[PDB]
Amino acid sequence: MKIAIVGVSGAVGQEFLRVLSQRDFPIDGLYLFGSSRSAGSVYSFKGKEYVVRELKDNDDFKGIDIAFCSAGGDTSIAFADTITRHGTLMIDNSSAFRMQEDVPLVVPEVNGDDALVHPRNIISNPNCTTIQMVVALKPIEDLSHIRRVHVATYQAASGAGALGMAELVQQVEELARGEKPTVDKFAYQLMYNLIPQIDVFTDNDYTKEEMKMYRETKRIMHSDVMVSATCVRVPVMRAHSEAIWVETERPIAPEEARAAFAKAPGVLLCDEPSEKQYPMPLFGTEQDPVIVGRIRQDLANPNGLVFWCVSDQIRKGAALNAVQIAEYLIAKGHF
Amino acid sequence: MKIAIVGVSGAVGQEFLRVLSQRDFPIDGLYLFGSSRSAGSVYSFKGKEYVVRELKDNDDFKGIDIAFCSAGGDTSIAFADTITRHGTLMIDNSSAFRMQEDVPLVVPEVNGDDALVHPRNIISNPNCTTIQMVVALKPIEDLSHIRRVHVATYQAASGAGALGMAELVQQVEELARGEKPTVDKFAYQLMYNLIPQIDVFTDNDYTKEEMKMYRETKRIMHSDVMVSATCVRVPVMRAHSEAIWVETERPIAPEEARAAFAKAPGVLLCDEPSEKQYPMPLFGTEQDPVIVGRIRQDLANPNGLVFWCVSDQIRKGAALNAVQIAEYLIAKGHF
């Protein structure tokens, strides 16, 4: 198996290097690609050193089985033709192709079989916050169909990439020193604040991030489910939190939901109120599961269930999900 | 008018001193009370200095018209008899009496007339997060009855008093210095974290804070409304944030809701997506209004409305609401 990483310089591209090693992904050849800014940089992987090639509209992807791309939708749109020119399967972290009906939109725990059919040899990774939500929703859906979801997100600085993380940390230093906080990558100061806007606004006054949770969830779950989200930036480094109300066609008691979560792939149940055990982003950082807790009945709806969950944006929210798609296809004999 | 402040040492008691001066509350005599820890301390108010008396089970409240108490439910339960012994009206910030049916539970913008009848000469201030929610809910209720509310809160360190605020600030310093964060007043590190537990758990696995939003809202709004809350501690100093989904008996369009908010007492509309204008706790800090924005239709419910709002926990969430109750009674000739 010959593997490409397109966009290796950033937080997610570095996570691909870590995950692919940690999970002993089968690799006979590794090929790193980036923009002219990253061309010529050196990275070591499993005891050997690799030199980044500039992504050009040529034949560099001949012989490459899978290309994991974390270079942004700009690059994916412009170079998808190049990457797939010689039969390479492009697993795209970008939002570029997520609404194309001939592009599968995959979370392996939920709709892994959708990955098997990729007429454009493109598969798209969903948005971070969608991935974490549907991993939690799938075990509930299997009990009784989910009609409606209200979700409030508490989303980390990593959503704005490594520069967003660095801005938050520098604000902590400036504030401790009594200096003015530098504000740049976020629209307002983030330390000691909450910004109830992630991505640009759309015509219905939801942001693009909130509409992704509406549109992508339907595709992934093959569902008429309607998700209304309020997505808020919070002073957390790289794990996202979600407060979720789910309405099902029949009531699900917390004990039935708890039993389903305890058996669900990709989920870690952490729900012991008497021990103050609940998901928190600081402890879900750099961990694989979607961590679920605060499970209770919905006081406002007899058909409602309420819970809280956490996942790492860089792992399950990005690179881990993409590797798990690739592992799923390997496991079904696709290669 | 002779006015007492019971529990003047803490953040809310100091806010009473500021608010009562700023709003030119009519004061002929001021009397400060606290525990033995605060007895003998000096505070200046409108150009004169006052010495704190220890709260004792005696006749110190003879001649006092109103006692604003911010000393915790322990003190209010123990000394309510003393404070009211000579006809003084006790306006209590504590949770002690909030479910006593002969104790009115008042937000002046919503049910001010309930304050006029106080057989025990006690009126209770509601919980911070309830106050901010019902100030926003009242203009929507007047359009169409609210049946159900889902609310996710993003609650500031000030909920844990001045020591909670000081713990957050010290964690910012320790983290900037690369030291271990001291953890004490909160159950876990709060900086770079979110704690989805405020107050102790109850038998239905909601916390006491979440159940206050259920129970107090019904009392204040004279309503069968059912509120299901997830209350989360966030790294913010003293302003609370709430993500709210409201279901009404008929659909309310965002433009109708916007018009109602723009005319509502105690509300400040801040909702211009194209200008990135929305409520944020950093800018609602040390301000009076409940700031409301991100108003949109609920994609999951044709009878749903979604919005976001912010208020200062120490002002409208505590001392300002209590002073406004007292001002309401003065204005109705009660004294």
Q: Print the SS3 string covering A136-171.
A: HHHHHHHHCCEEEEEEEEEECHHHHHHHHHHHHHHH
CATH 3.30.360.10 domain span(s) along chain B = 130-313
CATH superfamily assigned to domain A130-313:
Dihydrodipicolinate Reductase; domain 2 (3.30.360.10)
Is A155 in contact with A162 (CB distance < 8 Å)? no
Query: Residue B188, exposed/middle/buried by CB under 10 A (0-12, 13-18, 19+)?
Result: middle
Dihedral angle, C-alpha B181, B177, A156, B148, nearest 10 °: 40
CA distance A79 to A64: 15
Which positions in chain B touch A273 (Cβ < 8 Å)? 197, 201, 205
CA distance B189 to B237: 15
Which positions in chain A touch B216 (Cβ < 8 Å)? none
| Amino acid of residue A325 | I
Residue keyed to tokens 């989303």: A155
Dihedral angle, C-alpha A196, A202, A208, A214, nearest 10 °: 100
CA distance A47 to A200: 42
CA distance A151 to B219: 27
CA distance A271 to A278: 5
Q: CA B183: distance to chain centroid?
A: 26
CATH 3.40.50.720 domain span(s) along chain B = 2-126+318-331
Give me A31's structure tokens: 């090929």
Is A132 in contact with A309 (CB distance < 8 Å)? yes
| Strands lying side by side in the sheet with B239-248 | B226-233, B146-155, B239-248, B304-312, B290-297, B267-269
Is A14 in contact with A34 (CB distance < 8 Å)? no
Q: Which strand (E) or helix (H) includes residue B143?
A: helix B128-143
C-alpha triplet A50, A53, A57: angle, nearest 5°? 150
Q: Which residue of B has its CA nearest to A190?
A: B282
Q: Largest Cα–Cα distance of chain A, in whole Å?
A: 60
**Best to test chain A binding among B234, B248, B309 (most A CBs inside 10 Å):** B234
What is the distance between the terminal CA atoms of chain A, rounded to a whole angstrom? 9
A128 a catalytic residue: yes
**What top-level class would CATH report for the domain A2-126+318-331?**
alpha beta
Q: Which of A206, A232, A276 sits opposite B154 (nearest CB)?
A: A232
Which positions in chain A touch B295 (Cβ < 8 Å)? 205
Residues 6+ away with beta carbon under 8 Å from B188? A276, A280, A282, B195
Strands (E), chain B: 2-6, 29-34, 42-45, 48-51, 53-54, 66-69, 89-92, 122-124, 146-155, 226-233, 239-248, 267-269, 290-297, 304-312
DSSP structural state of residue A263:
T
Of B171, B167, B310, the C-alpha closest to B242 is: B310
**Best to test chain A binding among B299, B303, B306, B310 (most A CBs inside 10 Å):** B299
DSSP structural state of residue A277:
B
C-alpha triplet A216, A218, A219: angle, nearest 5°? 65
Cβ-based neighbour number of residue B333 at 10 Å: 7
This structure's resolution (angstroms)?
Answer: 1.7
A86 a catalytic residue: no
CA distance A208 to A99: 13
Is A10 in contact with A161 (CB distance < 8 Å)? yes
Kind of pairing between the strands at A146-155 and A267-269 = unpaired
